């Protein structure tokens, strides 16, 4: 996603944290002036201008392009060296949960987890390798040139003309999505990537013309918006498991 999609996933999630995860997220965020779950959500996309070294190391962590293999993930083939979103999200979840690490290490892992749960729910981050997740599919959208990747990351969301305060309650108004019965941080990333890939491959998502407009928006923007809500609910369920699961009896 672009920055608004990432923030909206975080804002949906933030309100769904259990008290244990609420306290721990807030404690990690408090170590960085002005940080909120929403404000850190775009951070991993900004690393060219914030941390170039980490930016180079983590560029491939935003994607897993499995569509040519019918959306059936295989880590050795699709994720050599762990360099894809499935394995990155698993590892960063482990790091985030490791209370023996420094607050700085765990806050960095939180930034990645918040961002990557968003990206792994973006269909065009789990699509074809050969066209760079739809980036090479250039099209006219209304009167403007774009590409299929950008259309899904931000172009359709932008048609609402809403800031986050207007968009958030619209996402919250949707019918509740069906989640996994319990979060498994090591297994769910593959499930989510495969589901996102199947959307990339659904009828008409790749359009039959290179001039699209309101008919495309009206059919597919609801699906993009459903994926934001789903991503936010899944992010809260994951943070509740990773940061909200300690067996505690102190008053
Ligand atoms: Zn993104
Ligand atoms: Zn993207
Ligand atoms: Zn990203």
Author numbering: 27 to 277
Authors' description from the paper:
Nucleases of the S1/P1 family have important applications in biotechnology and molecular biology. We have performed structural analyses of SmNuc1 nuclease from Stenotrophomonas maltophilia, including RNA cleavage product binding and mutagenesis in a newly discovered flexible Arg74‐motif, involved in substrate binding and product release and likely contributing to the high catalytic rate. The activity of SmNuc1 towards c‐di‐GMP in crystal resulted in a distinguished complex with the emerging product 5′‐GMP. This enzyme from an opportunistic pathogen relies on specific architecture enabling high performance under broad conditions, attractive for biotechnologies.
Purine nucleotide binding differs compared to pyrimidines, confirming the plasticity of the active site.
